[PDB]
Design a protein around this ligand. Structure first.
Ligand SMILES: COc1ccc(CC(=O)O)cc1-c1cccs1
Ligand SMILES: [Zn+2]
Ligand SMILES: [Zn+2]
Length: 585
């Protein structure tokens, strides 16, 4: 294994020759440990609070979920704690019959996904334009430096020789350039999956990439129209740690559809940075903080470019395999059998595969499946054997599905169908309100001015106006924040890193105009394009549903906050200064 990872370790060991040592009391059990060197401690035990959002959400000062979200440890202690809990495990190898079905399904799936699209390399200019349309940060300075691109070229020459010298995953500027260079090279070889939307619903059938949060509920409602059993949405316990060496070899099959120059670079990413990997992790010791150099041959590196797409692929594959078991196509004897009959698997894929993909909504490890009947509930042999063990449920207990798409959890949300005053229906995203408020009350980092803090607050308020307008407390709090923040100040930073976020709230355009564009004009499930001319006509959840989903409506502390909110708005206004504000209440 040193033949692939040795050069990377040699360069780390040489760079840190001063403090390099082999800590014999290292905590790694399933990862190969190579050594340690001293570093400064990174991260914090708590998260900085957004004073603007906090001052305009007083009733949630006394809310347990809101307090918990403000915590979140990122220090070397936090890193070690999380590592021990999930990351330091071994997934048992799937049985020979399971490996055979997975291989047949993977080959068929890749051919289906590549029926109209051809893979291609992504470029320096694509990467640059992406870094630029994210910040104005140090990555934008690196991308603007020609010396960064020369290091990239030197690493690619090693990759073409089947070698790696600096692509290390992290759990002066030379180490930063090497990290960003590693990410660019991965982007160059596998970025086409995201850039060319291989996991769009049109291209993948099950996928939802590029759809956006506001379309997910409509997609779940369309799946509900398909004849069959209940809708199942089982959570896998730490999906990324369950990606096996067999999953990685099935994912690699996409290289067969690539041009030879692309294939060579993609093969280098697969073989040297996915199927073999070198990881840096901080650890507190009595003498200070150390960086550990570890390695392994499986699992998914969570921060990588290919993660989302490759998790989506393997989950689509795994769910088709589970659907086959439910239908009686795969038996317990088949999974144990190395010599299992390939014909019935092929016949099912070529005659039913696409129809079976249409019964699903898959986003990374998140899945919703509507099988042809409920035999699926108890079809767990292949799912557990592939290593995709469901979270917090005995291994052999049947899955519980839903007969109402509105109760189905998907991508941290559930979705409600609303009837507008004019009779039109909307399908809206929703989650426990405390999670929305709790997140909005967290600022990103330290040394942020009241201006930057107020602008992130505005970003959260405007996201609420567009996605969560149907929640009484969030429309009220959103109006309060937008009233306290100067009208012409542009929302800054980002409310989420979610692939489902299209950030339509990152503007100074009127939120009702933006609402109309998203929910009426551009909405393909809105046949009648009549615009909504007033927020008074923008609906809310039924009062009982709003309360079931965490609303404080009907409580006195809430009635008091609603009554006294102009006072809190004015307090924020007086501390911001003599700017142009607008009254939204
Ligand atoms: C599926 O969409 C999500 C899932 C999770 C989260 C939470 C977070 O990332 O902080 C946010 C979102 C979105 C908010 C607005 C548009 S997407
Ligand atoms: Zn490399
Ligand atoms: Zn809800």
């Amino acid at each position: 294994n040193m033949d692939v990872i040795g050069e990377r370790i040699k360069r780390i060991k040489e760079e840190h020759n001063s403090t390099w040592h082999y800590d014999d009391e290292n905590p790694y059990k399933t990862w190969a440990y190579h050594g340690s060197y001293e570093v400064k401690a990174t991260g914090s035990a708590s998260s900085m609070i957004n004073g603007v959002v906090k001052l305009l959400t007083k009733p949630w000062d006394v809310v347990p979920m809101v307090t918990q979200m403000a915590m979140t440890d990122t220090t070397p202690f936090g890193q070690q704690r999380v590592f021990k809990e999930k990351v330091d495990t071994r997934t048992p190898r799937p049985l020979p019959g399971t490996r055979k079905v997975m291989e047949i399904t993977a080959e068929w799936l890749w051919r289906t996904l590549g029926r109209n699209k051809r893979p291609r390399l992504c470029t320096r200019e694509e990467f640059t334009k992406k870094v630029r349309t994210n910040a104005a940060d140090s990555a934008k300075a690196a991308v603007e430096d020609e010396e960064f691109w020369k290091l990239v070229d030197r690493e690619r020459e090693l990759h073409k020789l089947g070698k790696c010298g600096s692509c290390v995953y992290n759990m002066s500027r030379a180490i930063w350039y090497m990290w960003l260079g590693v990410r660019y090279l991965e982007f160059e070889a596998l970025g086409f999956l995201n850039e060319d939307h291989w996991f769009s619903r049109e291209n993948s059938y099950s996928g939802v990439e590029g759809e956006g949060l506001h379309k997910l509920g409509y997609i779940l409602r369309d799946i509900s129209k398909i004849p069959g059993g209940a809708m199942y949405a089982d959570d896998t316990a730490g999906w990324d740690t369950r990606i096996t060496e067999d999953d990685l070899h099935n994912e690699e099959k996409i290289i067969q559809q690539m041009d030879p120059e692309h294939r060579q670079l993609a093969n280098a990413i697969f073989k040297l940075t996915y199927q073999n990997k070198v990881v840096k992790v901080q650890r507190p010791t009595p003498t200070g903080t150390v960086m550990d150099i570890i390695s392994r041959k499986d699992q998914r590196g969570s921060g990588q470019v290919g993660t989302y797409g490759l998790n989506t692929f393997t989950n689509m594959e795994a769910q088709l395999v589970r659907q086959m078991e439910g239908e009686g196509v795969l038996t317990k004897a088949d999974l144990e059998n190395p010599h299992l009959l390939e014909k019935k698997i092929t016949q099912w894929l070529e005659t039913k595969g696409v129809e079976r993909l249409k019964r699903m909504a898959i986003s990374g490890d998140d899945c919703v499946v509507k099988p042809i009947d409920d035999r699926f509930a108890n079809a767990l042999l292949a799912l557990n054997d592939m290593g995709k063990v469901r979270k917090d449920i005995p291994q052999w207990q049947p899955s519980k599905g839903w007969h109402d798409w509105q109760q189905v959890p998907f991508c941290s949300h559930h979705f409600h169908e609303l009837i507008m005053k004019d009779g039109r229906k909307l399908v809206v995203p929703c989650r426990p309100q405390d999670e929305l408020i709790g997140r909005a009350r967290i600022s990103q980092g330290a040394g942020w001015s009241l201006r930057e803090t107020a602008c992130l607050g505005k970003a959260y308020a405007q996201m609420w106006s567009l996605m969560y307008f149907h929640r009484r407390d969030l429309r009220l709090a959103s109006n309060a924040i937008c009233s306290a923040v100067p009208v012409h100040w542009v929302p800054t930073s980002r409310t989420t890193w979610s692939i489902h976020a299209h950030h339509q709230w990152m503007t100074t355009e009127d939120m009702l105009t933006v609402w109309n564009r998203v929910w009426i004009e551009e909405n393909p499930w809105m046949e009648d394009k009549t615009p909504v001319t007033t927020w008074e006509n923008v609906p809310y959840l039924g009062k009982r549903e709003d309360q079931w989903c965490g609303s404080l409506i009907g409580l006195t502390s809430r009635a008091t906050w609603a009554q006294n909110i102009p006072t809190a708005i004015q307090q924020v206004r007086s501390l911001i200064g003599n700017e142009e504000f607008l009254d939204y209440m």
